[PDB]
Amino acid sequence: TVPQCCYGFCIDLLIKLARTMQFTYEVHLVADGKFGTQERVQNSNKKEWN
Amino acid sequence: PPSIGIAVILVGTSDEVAIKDAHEKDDFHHLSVVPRVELVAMNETDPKSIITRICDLMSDRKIQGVVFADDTDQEAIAQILDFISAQTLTPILGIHGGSSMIMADKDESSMFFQFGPSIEQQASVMLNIMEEYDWYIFSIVTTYFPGYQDFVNKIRSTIENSFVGWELEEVLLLDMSLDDGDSKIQNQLKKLQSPIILLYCTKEEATYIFEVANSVGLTGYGYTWIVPSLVAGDTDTVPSEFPTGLISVSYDEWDYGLPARVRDGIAIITTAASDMLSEHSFIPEPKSSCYNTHEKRIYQSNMLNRYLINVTFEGRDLSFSEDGYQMHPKLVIILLNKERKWERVGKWKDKSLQMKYYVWPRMCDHLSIVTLEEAP
Amino acid sequence: KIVNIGAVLSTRKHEQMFREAVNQANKRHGSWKIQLQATSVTHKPNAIQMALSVCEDLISSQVYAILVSHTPTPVSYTAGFYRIPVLGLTTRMSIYSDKSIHLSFLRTVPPYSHQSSVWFEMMRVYNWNHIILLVSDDHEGRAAQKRLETLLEERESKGPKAEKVLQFDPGTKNVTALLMEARELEARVIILSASEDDAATVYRAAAMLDMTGSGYVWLVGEREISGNALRYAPDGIIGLQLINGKNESAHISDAVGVVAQAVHELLEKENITDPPRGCVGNTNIWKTGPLFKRVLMSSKYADGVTGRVEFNEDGDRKFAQYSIMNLQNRKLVQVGIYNGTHVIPNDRKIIWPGGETEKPRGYQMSTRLKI
């Protein structure tokens, strides 16, 4: 888990969002590539968006 | 390398001669410890008596395991047998009848064992046969007996995550403790048009239930309810509830020798002994007495189960699951015959089934076709 | 005739007063065609010989029904071995409420899991539109947590909508995950779920969490809270308990109450199937015993010695009164009650965890925005 930089267009859109109603942007990285889709595991009968 | 004591329960008319012979005969140079064998049998099976002479069994000699063979198929006494078992916290495996039967996920202190796949895993091989049968459409129905939502999620997710086009519609929940005076079994359940149906209930409850199924004429050519193992119960006892050509599977019984798999069982006890001398190199002391529960209470810390995980011998894999399901189990598909007798519908093992009939046999508009593949 | 009645308890004196209950019952119900018969043995630590006495006394007597009170009652699992009527009393553990393990367990006491419903009443109490659930990791504990979901899942009709819960293995050293999520948690509403030692590590970490002041609400039952748990217990803690929680004698009284209620319903039965005498080697169960269980099921008594009460479809009781309590100057103090739907506050004010008793808004936005 390393630091990085946040540079992006839509990222800046978020910046503008906080610029409307104030919230301090804390940008994590994305552990995985995607957002998620509820999908069953090898067990548990639970569709998990990972 | 010490003599390993174990016990074998016997209830009902059976051949213990070759059982005792092989018990002395069965041995492995890969077995570091020798067995200590004392045979046992009883007419009265009640844990009053059964658990009585079981406490007397831990009391007299040291027998580290109990092979339970029962006269009847009612397994309640086998479950409570697991209860007294964990009470003793000694190893045990039901070898026959309801003793080898599966009950739900006992307390963390229960080392009771059995030979076969999980009833869940059973249903798995079941729908697997639904693949062997090439019958796309299917549906489920069941009463309020336990594992209801368990098998429900098992199947729903089972075929759900699949890439196959196996067809399904809905399942029918019921409660057979009470009944429907309006025959909501018949009245409501008649709405099921699925080309294949699933029957899961208690054989007793399945008597009146499947009687209502007769009242629904669900036996029609093409119309059938596939069924479970213990629900089907003994292939010997023929209920009128089961329709002609009843579609169900179970653990190997008619073909598989029960005392043979019993030799397999004690052999598996000796396998736990093998890995036990391998790793722990020590075996716990025997349980003194049932009243001695005060004395031996603090004496139970069991990695034997933690060792019992991987078990295999004589080319067979004796490992149960964390839920006790045999690692590489084997089961038998069966169906009532034209003689009104359950006839083998297949052998379920390795997630594979040998099937004699090239199709699900139907006799009672099926129309052949053939061509060659030429696009378009 | 005289109806043999067994009971499982600690001592034979309360059993003597229990035979007195057999007398008051033989007077209560119609005694013409039947009478009360009281013979019983206490609960010994080893359940083996306890079951030996179970079959010995009861099965040989082939009684109509038996009683039990405080792993326990595996011999009542043996009452399932005959599937015969037998009475539980002291159970706050819903493991005893398992339909598989216990086919039919008839008792007049709710399990501690029902304290979830209590926690929903608390949802009406603290009125927090946010919630969270603190729980140890167990199987039965997990089940109770599922019931807690049901309480939340009850809101799905058209709510507090607890953010998250987590499991904590028995005697877990580092709760830093739990308290961690607490730091992560913006709302102040947390639903504590624990057993005794579980509660010990709980409050211990809560101090270690330094969340013990106002701004952290972790609610649970005396079953978690009471006892040596109260020693390390958190500050200003408040909770409730089922009315007449620890009282065994009254449990014996009303126990006889619904018991003789089951004598009238048994008298209300017909084509009586005798309780089986033969036990060892007995492969069958009389159809009466379970039909008697359904009898107790259809039976709803007007009142017991515990008063007018309700029961569940699982057979557990219902309508029961959770008596609101609170920790006052490191000492427990009863703060009120909640019973059917009715939460009765007492004249004592409801103390918040900090010095102030007032209820602020626990859910608060974190300006730092994790994305």
Q: DSSP letters along C246-263, please?
A: S-HHHHHHHHHHHHHHHH
- Shortest Cα distance, chain C CAs vs residue B77, angstroms: 6
Q: DSSP letters along A19-39, please?
A: HHS--EEE----SSSS-----
Nearest to C260 by CA among C32, C27, C62, C70: C27
Minimal Cβ distance to C77: which of B46, B83, B291:
B83
Q: DSSP letters along B146-185, please?
A: SSHHHHHHHHHHHHHS-SS------EEE---SS--TT-HH
| SS3 state at C344 | strand
Angle at B138 between CA B133 and CA B139, to 5 degrees: 145
The encoded tokens of residue A39 equal 């999908």
Q: Answer yes or no: are the C-beta atoms of B331 and B325 closer than 8 Å.
A: no
Q: Answer yes or no: are the C-beta atoms of C76 and C98 closer than 8 Å.
A: no
- Shortest Cα distance, chain C CAs vs residue A45, angstroms: 15
C-alpha neighbours within 13 Å on the C-beta side of residue B38: 17
Q: Answer yes or no: are the C-beta atoms of B342 and B232 closer than 8 Å.
A: yes
Nearest to C118 by CA among C190, C203, C216, C221: C221
DSSP structural state of residue C276: P
The encoded tokens of residue C28 equal 């209560």
DSSP percent split of chain B into helix, strand, coil, nearest 5: 30, 15, 55
| SS3 state at C14 | helix
The residues with which C217 forms a beta bridge, in sequence order, are C189
The encoded tokens of residue B369 equal 């076709």
* Subunits with 3+ C-beta pairs closer than 8 A to C: A, B
DSSP structural state of residue B99: G
- How far is residue C86's CA from residue C252's CA, in Å, rounded to a whole number? 14
- How far is residue C325's CA from residue C239's CA, in Å, rounded to a whole number? 5
Nearest to B121 by CA among B371, B343, B330, B335: B330
Q: How far is CA C142 from CA C91, C115, C136, C170, C255, in A?
A: 18, 14, 8, 12, 30
Chain B, nearest residue to A38 by Cα:
B161
Amino acid type, B49: S
Helix (H) or strand (E) holding B140: strand B140-142
- How far is residue B138's CA from residue C219's CA, in Å, rounded to a whole number? 48
Burial of C360 (0-12, 13-18, 19+ CB in 10 A): exposed
Q: After which residues is chain B broken (C to N over 2.5 A)?
A: 364
Collect all residues of chain B within an 8 Å Cβ-Cβ radius of residue C282.
46
Q: DSSP letters along C120-173, please?
A: HHHHHHT--S---EEE---HHHHHHHHHHHHHHHHGGG-------EE---TT-S
Report cis status (omega within 30 of 0) of the bond before C170.
no
What contacts B133, CB < 8 A, 6 or more positions away?
Answer: B196, B359, B360
Chain centroid offset of residue B314 CA: 21
Amino acid type, C30: G
DSSP structural state of residue B110: -
Residue with the two structure tokens 């998620």: A36
Q: Answer yes or no: are the C-beta atoms of C324 and C337 closer than 8 Å.
A: yes
Amino acid type, C45: P
If DSSP states are collapsed to H, E and C, what string results for B255-288?
Answer: CCCHHHHHHHHHHHHHHHHHHHHHCCCCCCCCCC
Q: Answer yes or no: are the C-beta atoms of B216 and B186 closer than 8 Å.
A: yes
Q: Answer yes or no: are the C-beta atoms of B7 and B57 closer than 8 Å.
A: yes
Q: Answer yes or no: are the C-beta atoms of B17 and B46 closer than 8 Å.
A: no
Angle at C59 between CA C55 and CA C63, to 5 degrees: 135
- Shortest Cα distance, chain C CAs vs residue B333, angstroms: 27
Q: How many residue contacts between A and B have a Cβ separation below 8 Å? A: 7
Q: A24–C367: do the CB atoms touch at under 8 Å?
A: yes
Helix (H) or strand (E) holding C26: helix C13-28
- How far is residue B259's CA from residue B271's CA, in Å, rounded to a whole number? 18
Q: Answer yes or no: are the C-beta atoms of C43 and C70 closer than 8 Å.
A: yes
Q: How far is CA A6 from CA A1, A2, A23, in A?
A: 15, 13, 16
Burial of B109 (0-12, 13-18, 19+ CB in 10 A): middle
The encoded tokens of residue B143 equal 């009463």
DSSP structural state of residue C67: E
Q: Answer yes or no: are the C-beta atoms of C74 and B84 closer than 8 Å.
A: yes
Q: Answer yes or no: are the C-beta atoms of B296 and B55 closer than 8 Å.
A: no
DSSP structural state of residue B316: B
Residue with the two structure tokens 């109260």: C230
The encoded tokens of residue C68 equal 């039990």
Q: B293–C46: do the CB atoms touch at under 8 Å?
A: yes
What contacts B100, CB < 8 A, 6 or more positions away?
Answer: B68, B93, B94, B114, B115, B116, B251
The encoded tokens of residue B212 equal 């209502």
Chain centroid offset of residue B268 CA: 17
C355: alpha, beta or left? (left if phi > 0; alpha if psi -120 to 50): alpha
Q: Answer yes or no: are the C-beta atoms of C125 and C174 closer than 8 Å.
A: no
Q: What is the crossing angle of helices C248-267 and C288-298, to 10°?
A: 110
Q: How many CB atoms lie within 10 A of CB C345?
A: 13
Q: What is the crossing angle of helices B148-160 and B119-132, to 10°?
A: 40
Phi, psi (degrees; rounded to nearest 5) at C28: -60, -70
- How far is residue B359's CA from residue C323's CA, in Å, rounded to a whole number? 66
The encoded tokens of residue C175 equal 């709760």
DSSP structural state of residue A40: B
- How far is residue B338's CA from residue B245's CA, in Å, rounded to a whole number? 7
Nearest to C114 by CA among C303, C299, C259, C311: C311
* Subunits with 3+ C-beta pairs closer than 8 A to B: A, C
B366 is in an annotated binding site: no
B96 is in an annotated binding site: yes
Amino acid type, C132: I
DSSP structural state of residue C234: P
- How far is residue B100's CA from residue B113's CA, in Å, rounded to a whole number? 8
Q: How many CB atoms lie within 10 A of CB B328?
A: 13
The residues with which B333 forms a beta bridge, in sequence order, are B249, B346
Report cis status (omega within 30 of 0) of the bond before B243.
no
- How far is residue C241's CA from residue C122's CA, in Å, rounded to a whole number? 12
Q: Tell me if chain C has a CB within 8 Å of the CB of B294.
A: yes
Helix (H) or strand (E) holding C13: helix C13-28
Angle at B296 between CA B291 and CA B302, to 5 degrees: 130
- How far is residue C247's CA from residue C358's CA, in Å, rounded to a whole number? 33
What experimental approach yielded this model?
A: cryo-EM
Q: Answer yes or no: are the C-beta atoms of A6 and A27 closer than 8 Å.
A: yes
Q: Which of C101, C104, C140 to mutate to test the interface with B (most CBs of B within 10 A)?
A: C101
Q: C51–B84: do the CB atoms touch at under 8 Å?
A: yes
Q: Answer yes or no: are the C-beta atoms of B270 and B31 closer than 8 Å.
A: yes
DSSP percent split of chain C into helix, strand, coil, nearest 5: 35, 15, 45
Nearest to C261 by CA among C292, C223, C220: C292
Report chain A's C-alpha Rg in angstroms: 16
Q: Tell me if chain A has a CB within 8 Å of the CB of C48.
A: no
- How far is residue B255's CA from residue B119's CA, in Å, rounded to a whole number? 20
Q: Answer yes or no: are the C-beta atoms of C225 and C200 closer than 8 Å.
A: no
- How far is residue C107's CA from residue C317's CA, in Å, rounded to a whole number? 7
Nearest to B127 by CA among B156, B148, B105, B103: B156
Q: A24–C368: do the CB atoms touch at under 8 Å?
A: yes
- How far is residue B276's CA from residue B280's CA, in Å, rounded to a whole number? 5
Q: Tell me if chain B has a CB within 8 Å of the CB of C298.
A: no
Q: How far is CA B177 from CA B144, B180, C82, C270, in A?
A: 8, 10, 17, 19
- How far is residue B4's CA from residue B33's CA, in Å, rounded to a whole number? 7
Q: Answer yes or no: are the C-beta atoms of B143 and B340 closer than 8 Å.
A: no
The encoded tokens of residue C362 equal 């626990």
Interface of A with C in 2-31 (CB under 8 A): 14, 18, 22-28
| SS3 state at B349 | strand
DSSP structural state of residue B115: S
Q: How far is CA B349 from CA B248, B271, C148, C161, in A?
A: 15, 22, 41, 46
- How far is residue C279's CA from residue B77's CA, in Å, rounded to a whole number? 12
What contacts B236, CB < 8 A, 6 or more positions away?
Answer: none
What contacts B103, CB < 8 A, 6 or more positions away?
Answer: B75, B78, B79, B82, C100
| SS3 state at B52 | helix
Q: How many CB atoms lie within 10 A of CB A1?
A: 5
Q: How far is CA C16 from CA B336, C21, C22, C250, in A?
A: 59, 9, 9, 14
Q: Tell me if chain B has a CB within 8 Å of the CB of C74.
A: yes
Q: How far is CA B315 from CA A44, B255, C325, in A?
A: 32, 18, 64
Q: Answer yes or no: are the C-beta atoms of B171 and B142 closer than 8 Å.
A: yes
Q: Which of B157, B321, B325 to mutate to test the interface with A (most CBs of A within 10 A)?
A: B157
The runs of H, that is alpha helices, within chain C are 13-28, 47-53, 60-61, 74-81, 115-125, 139-154, 176-184, 196-209, 222-225, 229-232, 248-267, 288-298
DSSP structural state of residue C285: -
- How far is residue B132's CA from residue B125's CA, in Å, rounded to a whole number? 10
Q: C280–B72: do the CB atoms touch at under 8 Å?
A: no
- How far is residue B91's CA from residue B363's CA, in Å, rounded to a whole number? 49
- How far is residue B275's CA from residue B182's CA, in Å, rounded to a whole number? 59
